[PDB]
């Protein structure tokens, strides 16, 4: 995140950290994600696209730091990895960039409720906040687009939702942005999501609840003028999510 503040997981208890193991001894961070129900995490498909081998990923919940432990964290394996059929990427945008990860603990359980682990709410069918609403993004992604490392402490920032008319202007992203995407930026283009923030949540309050309104998907550069961050519009994928999720 460019700008923002450093925080702890108590402030985003539904944020999940996804890492990948390497036949060498190192685990590296991949993308962020959010807990929907005890056993399901939602992220972005482009994070798995190049290496869809579930057995090599690890998911941690209750994590405030990237490579150091946090007391209260939980580690899970990916029992199921569901990528979107129709996922496409062009010279900028990713389409249907949403993925589901069913998690299992080494003891056979899903996430347990704590002060550092909670689920986030889903919107109702195609229901979104209006442009102008301030939403928060969180993640361990880059703090400057030129850096080549990720921060060790979690960060969060607040951005505002902008309309499709503003984002589809020729000097923004033209028709690369579709009705299944949402754009969010800072009025003064000072803070934004960036590389390493993919898959994590864009949370806004809807009808009283903190709702997962978007998933970090793409953007041209980070915190660039007239180059908003584009997110997957969760309210438009509810049927898809439903057809794959079940029980507790």
């Amino acid at each position: 995140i460019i700008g923002g503040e450093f925080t702890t997981i108590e402030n985003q208890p539904w944020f999940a950290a996804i890492y990948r193991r390497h036949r060498g001894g190192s685990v590296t961070y991949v993308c962020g994600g959010s807990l929907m129900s005890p056993c399901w995490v939602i992220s972005a498909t482009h994070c798995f696209i190049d290496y869809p081998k579930k057995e090599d990923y690890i998911v941690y919940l209750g994590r405030s730091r990237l490579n150091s432990n946090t007391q209260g964290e939980m580690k899970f394996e990916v029992e199921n990895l569901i990528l979107h059929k129709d996922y496409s990427a062009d010279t900028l945008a990713h389409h249907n960039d949403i993925a589901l990860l069913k998690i299992r603990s080494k003891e056979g359980r899903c996430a347990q409720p704590s002060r550092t682990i909670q689920t986030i709410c889903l919107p109702s069918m195609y229901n979104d906040p209006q442009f102008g609403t301030s939403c928060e993004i969180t993640g361990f992604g880059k703090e400057a687009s030129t850096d080549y490392l990720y921060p060790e402490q979690l960060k969060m920032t607040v951005v505002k939702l902008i309309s499709h008319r503003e984002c589809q202007q020729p000097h923004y992203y033209g028709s690369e942005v579709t009705t299944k995407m949402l754009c969010a930026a800072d009025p003064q283009w000072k803070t934004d999501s960036c590389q390493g923030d993919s898959g994590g949540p864009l949370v806004c309050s809807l009808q009283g609840r903190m709702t997962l309104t978007g998933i970090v998907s793409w953007g041209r550069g980070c915190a660039l003028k007239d180059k908003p961050g584009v997110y997957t519009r969760v309210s438009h994928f509810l049927p898809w999510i439903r057809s794959h999720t079940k029980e507790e």
């Binding site: 108590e10 402030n11 985003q12 208890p13 409720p113 909670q118 986030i120 709410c121």
Partner: peptide
């Protein structure tokens, strides 16, 4: 206790 979506404690 139990999950209450969207709640920070």
């Amino acid at each position: 206790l139990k999950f209450q979506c969207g709640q920070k404690t």
